[PDB]
Design a protein around this nucleic acid. Structure first.
Ligand SMILES: [Ca+2]
Ligand SMILES: [Ca+2]
Ligand SMILES: [Ca+2]
Ligand SMILES: [Ca+2]
Ligand SMILES: [Ca+2]
Ligand SMILES: [Ca+2]
Ligand SMILES: [Ca+2]
Length: 112
RNA sequence: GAAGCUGACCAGACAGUCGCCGCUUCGUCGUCGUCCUCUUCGGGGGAGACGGGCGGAGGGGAGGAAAGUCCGGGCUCCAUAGGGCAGGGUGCCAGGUAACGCCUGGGGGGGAAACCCACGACCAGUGCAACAGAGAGCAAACCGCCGAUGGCCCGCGCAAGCGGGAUCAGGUAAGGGUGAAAGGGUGCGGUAAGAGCGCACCGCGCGGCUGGUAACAGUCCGUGGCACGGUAAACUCCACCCGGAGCAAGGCCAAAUAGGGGUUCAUAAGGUACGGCCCGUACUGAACCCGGGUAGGCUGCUUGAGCCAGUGAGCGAUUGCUGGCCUAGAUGAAUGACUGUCCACGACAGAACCCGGCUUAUCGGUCAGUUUC
RNA sequence: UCUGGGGCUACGUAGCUCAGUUGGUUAGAGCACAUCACUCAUAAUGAUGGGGUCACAGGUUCGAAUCCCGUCGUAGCCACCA
């Protein structure tokens, strides 16, 4: 079961505001993750790519698609922790292989 | 035998992955002032239907540009009888829904080494360092200006005739030159060191002849050596607007603040649409808070003048007609990697109201048209 | 350290604040750091250090900036019931 329903995506800015009021910061100077412990069990994801933070509008959409595919491909493996991914300016230089391996190393250490 | 640029033109992919989205059939939860079968009222046998509502079966969802209302049009509450007309737009003529800044060519040049029209009245007022007042008025001519119409001085017995003295409205300044791009031509008695003072020749306004739906094209006839050939949203003209802001603008379910409050009222400066300009026509008010609530939704253009072949007409873009095609749009926001045959390597960007254009980042494939030998 | 359809503007006049219907003008002032009677060392009643291509080739008389359909970024706000 590796589906991707609409209910598994954020649809209200209120939840965004709540998680941004008290975010948990842990990541790298190039890519980082914010989020908090969830109570409903089913993991959730969210995407915030600022035009100022990330220029080259041909990106983001590609980045959104790639990160959504990685999330749905590794939905069950990751714990109930909510996750939101934010990429800094220096991301486009790394290719897809580098991005995939960096995300793999990142998510292979969150062992609690 | 080898090379530019536009007219247009191409951005498919699959045997497995993993699977984001409207529709029809079978049922799954609650019903219908068309109700037959019954109505004994648990609803069974329905002709037509809904909801972020699940299980199957099918067709589909990225550029020559959607960023950029940059220009014009398609569609809502609230006004709308100018002989007012301030102010922004065709400025060569004709052309399709109401539409403009797309396209055709003659008179004017670089009608091939430039595809460019943005070619409308110019002393109908008195203005910007080049401090040479020539690009608005000026001239102690610049090794020619007494080498003579008007005065003086140096050489004179009928008071004849030469050189200079940069003195004056002394032919002058473009026939010569010094920073401004030489703002016409040798010439006939221009001879007075010569200022167009009468001059065949190219060119201006005015009118006839060949064409013109239209700007004009040939000194064929005249008058003038002529008198400004040169800087336009730099006073001005309209046959089409004068309607603001735009699609997040009307419509809804058993939820309760029309809530102290402000510049004073029987004509006058509170929000006169239409004039930061005078009216025609008249809401029981007048720069704000002290948020009472809100993400549960949908038609509005989603069968929209977009497309193909065949007709009297063209230097040029056309559809009166014949089949159709039309199976791409939920508002955190629609596309991933691999075992492969042409190989033109995936450069840069985005699909949620629509169309006609923009020398654009556009490497790659040439049908029409170039000079070279 | 918050937002993809959409808008009237302020800017490359040094990166901000004042803005010129080309007043032929290497020209102004208030932030990083500086010299003079040693402010009992929290800057301007005085002289100045002035990489102010005043965005890219653009008026074929000499020109940047009022005359750009060819590009970037920040700040003044918007769905109803009366
Ligand atoms: Ca294509
Ligand atoms: Ca458009
Ligand atoms: Ca309204
Ligand atoms: Ca298609
Ligand atoms: Ca649409
Ligand atoms: Ca819609
Ligand atoms: Ca086209």
């Amino acid at each position: 079961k590796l589906a991707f329903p609409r209910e598994l995506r954020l649809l209200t800015p209120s939840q965004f505001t709540f998680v941004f009021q008290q975010p948990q910061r842990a990541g790298t100077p190039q890519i980082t993750i914010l989020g908090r412990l969830n109570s409903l069990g089913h993991p959730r994801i969210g995407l915030t790519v600022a035009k100022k933070n990330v220029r080259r509008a041909h990106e983001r959409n590609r980045i959104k698609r790639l990160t959504r595919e990685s999330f749905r491909l590794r939905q069950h493996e990751l714990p109930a922790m909510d996750f939101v991914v934010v990429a800094k300016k220096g991301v486009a230089d790394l290719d897809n292989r580098a991005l995939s391996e960096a995300l793999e190393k990142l998510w292979r250490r969150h062992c609690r």
